[PDB]
Design a protein around this ligand. Sequence first.
Ligand SMILES: [Fe+3]
Ligand SMILES: [Fe+3]
Ligand SMILES: [Fe+3]
Ligand SMILES: [Fe+3]
Ligand SMILES: [Fe+3]
Ligand SMILES: [Fe+3]
Ligand SMILES: [Fe+3]
Ligand SMILES: [Fe+3]
Ligand SMILES: [Fe+3]
Ligand SMILES: [Fe+3]
Lengths: 116, 116, 116, 116
Amino acid sequence: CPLMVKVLDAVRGSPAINVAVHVFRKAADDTWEPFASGKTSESGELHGLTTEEEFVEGIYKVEIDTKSYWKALGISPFHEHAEVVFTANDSGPRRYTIAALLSPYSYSTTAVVTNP
Amino acid sequence: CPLMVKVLDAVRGSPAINVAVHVFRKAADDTWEPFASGKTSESGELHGLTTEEEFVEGIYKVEIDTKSYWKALGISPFHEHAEVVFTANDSGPRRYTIAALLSPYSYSTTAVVTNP
Amino acid sequence: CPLMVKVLDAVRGSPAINVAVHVFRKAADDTWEPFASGKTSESGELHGLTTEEEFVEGIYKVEIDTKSYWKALGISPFHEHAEVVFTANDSGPRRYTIAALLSPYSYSTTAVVTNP
Amino acid sequence: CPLMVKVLDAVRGSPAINVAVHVFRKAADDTWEPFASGKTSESGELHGLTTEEEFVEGIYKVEIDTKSYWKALGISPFHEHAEVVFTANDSGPRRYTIAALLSPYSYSTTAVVTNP
Ligand SMILES: [Fe+3]
Ligand SMILES: [Fe+3]
Ligand SMILES: [Fe+3]
Ligand SMILES: [Fe+3]
Ligand SMILES: [Fe+3]
Ligand SMILES: [Fe+3]
Ligand SMILES: [Fe+3]
Ligand SMILES: [Fe+3]
Ligand SMILES: [Fe+3]
Ligand SMILES: [Fe+3]
């Protein structure tokens, strides 16, 4: 798994379950081609999005939708989408972990990049 | 002044200075319309984006252009932007402060609501 | 005012109000001596902790008492405190701002240095 | 592993390797008994600190020292210790993950608590 996504809730200190994640790649004619997608697990993690063979250098957009998570808590969320855009594998192949930390009025996001 | 944006640099222990900030507002056809923009001062604050009477109820998006910020300091950062999305309610006159904390690989955004 | 401490609540989207803050200074026998303390105002700011002439070069520690803060709001938080440790250099007159962002299970501290 | 510790560098976006970690437990006569200790790995993680049989309810202090990490980067760090104090296993057994995010002027720390 070269690309992991974690989502956490800063209020509850728990993993965010069933967050929808959509990954896009910037395509040749200046548009976003679909690339991968999934839901986060009990542990709030999602990998198995791609393989090193499909995860070529390029520009990727990672979108999350947290509607299912707040719904199951009985929370009527105010906002529920977040996104990052980064450039991948420019120095050849790396593993990316992208973590998001949720509060109703605060959003934090961190990227860890490691060598496979 | 009803809308403040404050931005800090976690690497250098200082306000982020001259960072461009674009504020959009969500329009009747669910698109984003430009609302305001500016650059951060030496103390990292940007205000004078809008008057009380022009900052109506709605959904607003603040894009802080951090890629150019880090690149100017000779750092290839991970993110393109820092963003946050928030809702202004039609309530009384209220101060909205958007605070941003920046690293090359991590950032956090927070919307703070007060009365002056 | 050379030492400011600002504290925000990420859950409630507001300044943290009435939070106790204790500042210690590292003494000649490598122990911590009380330096200053106070409570945060309605805008979450605490200043008037020290004068320019009494805030000498050294190593200082800010303990923000967040357990009691969250418990007062009926939340059993994870941390006891938020802390940060920083060094004042003997340089010119400089403004030190300690900013704190608080959730029940996550918190961040930042020391910002400016000139007034 | 009921107790994991991660340490990350927000400047480099990399795991912090060889961070020394010392865990203490609050003992009956109001003092800190040693409990567990270790160094973080290539991936910045440390588990194998304890077992569910030794990780009883109580008050634990987790200390890190990041001297070896900065040394190997050729960095003369200003500060290099951090600590959290929390109460464990009060609602019976839980798994704790404690993550710390480093910048020279900013420190963030998050706790994720999950059900084994
Ligand atoms: Fe499972
Ligand atoms: Fe299960
Ligand atoms: Fe995992
Ligand atoms: Fe101000
Ligand atoms: Fe909001
Ligand atoms: Fe002020
Ligand atoms: Fe410092
Ligand atoms: Fe290894
Ligand atoms: Fe290895
Ligand atoms: Fe692991």
